[PDB]
Amino acid sequence: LPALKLALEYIVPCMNKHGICVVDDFLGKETGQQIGDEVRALHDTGKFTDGQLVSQDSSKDIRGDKITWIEGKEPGCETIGLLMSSMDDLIRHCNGKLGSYKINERTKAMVACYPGNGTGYVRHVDNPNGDGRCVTCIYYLNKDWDAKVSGGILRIFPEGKAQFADIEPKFDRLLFFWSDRRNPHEVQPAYATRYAITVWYFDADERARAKVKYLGVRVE
Ligand SMILES: O=C(O)CNC(=O)c1nc(Cl)c2ccccc2c1O
Ligand SMILES: [Mn+2]
């Protein structure tokens, strides 16, 4: 599907209505599997961190999600860069229709690997203090994921709503949601290796004034 039809007929109305939007089969099996291959290659060659220290004898320490930051131009990351370009194309075609936000900037990609040792990620808000991030975009890479046996569901707790939104981390699934306090969320314990790629998109105004908050030119 062209970035434009998805954006205009699904992503814009869904984000303005629900603030949580899922696109399945975003890039297709061939491209999705190549991205999976690149991510697994990064993992197998030690490009990830050792993992979030979950509990602290140091040999018995439990570590959780591993991460690596990817620009998309690195050797062996070109298909990740293609994913990032595709995300950018969608956001570009949503211009002026997501909230009243103006998006002209993003982060690098954060590739995350939950190692499958029963660790997850605690309930949190991505941007609770106004750092400029307005949309969280996550792409999942896990073929034939069965949450009934592997866990790893993303559970979102939409504000003002007495309800859960449970999202399985399915292969070739793209997810968008508002990054601020509207969408507290958690990753339930994962019992199999679980990969995802996240990009955050900035609202230009919030980012500009965030620079005032968290602050140079020489004076002679
Ligand atoms: O992977 C998922 O479905 C959802 N993950 C997250 O919400 C998530 N959020 C943050 Cl802020 C971090 C932050 C650092 C490392 C991993 C994260 C993560 O997986
Ligand atoms: Mn998060």
SS (H, E, C) 208-219: HHHHHHCCCCCC
The full set of domain ranges for the chain reads 1-220
Which residue has a Cα nearest atom 8 of ligand 1?
Answer: 121
Contacts of 46 (CB under 8 A, 6+ apart): none
Q: Ligand 2 centroid vs 185 CA: distance in angstroms?
A: 6
Q: Which residue among 49, 54, 111, 121 has the greatest number of ligand 1 atoms within 8 angstroms of its CB, and so is best to mutate?
A: 121
Nearest CA to 119 among 68, 66, 63, 168? 63
- Name the residue at shortest CA distance from atom 19 of ligand 1: 112
Q: Report which residue type is found at 118.
A: G
Distance from C-alpha of 169 to C-alpha of 117, rounded to nearest angstrom: 16
H or E segment at 83? helix 78-93
Question: 42-73 burial by CB neighbour count: b if 16+ within 10 A, else e?
Answer: bbeeebbeebbebeeeeeeeeebbbebebebe
Contacts 24+ apart (CB under 8 A), 101-105: 101/134, 101/135, 101/203, 102/203, 102/204, 102/205, 103/134, 103/135, 103/201, 103/202, 103/203, 103/204, 104/202, 104/204, 105/132, 105/201, 105/202, 105/204, 105/207
Query: Are β-strands 174-178 and 20-23 bridged in parallel, bridged antiparallel, or unpaired?
Result: antiparallel
Cα 126 from Cα 201, distance rounded (Å): 12
Experimental method: X-ray
Q: Resolution of this entry in Å?
A: 1.7
> What's the DSSP call for residue 184?
-
Is 182 annotated in a binding site? The answer is no
- Ligand-binding annotation for 18, yes or no, is no
Q: Give the H or E element holding residue 42.
A: helix 29-44
Residue nearest to atom 1 of ligand 1 (CA): 196
Helix axes 78-93, 29-44, angle to 10 degrees: 130
Classified by CATH at the fold level, domain 1-220 comes out as Jelly Rolls (2.60.120)
Residues with beta carbon inside 6 Å of ligand 1? 65, 67, 112, 121, 124, 126, 138, 154, 169, 185, 187, 196
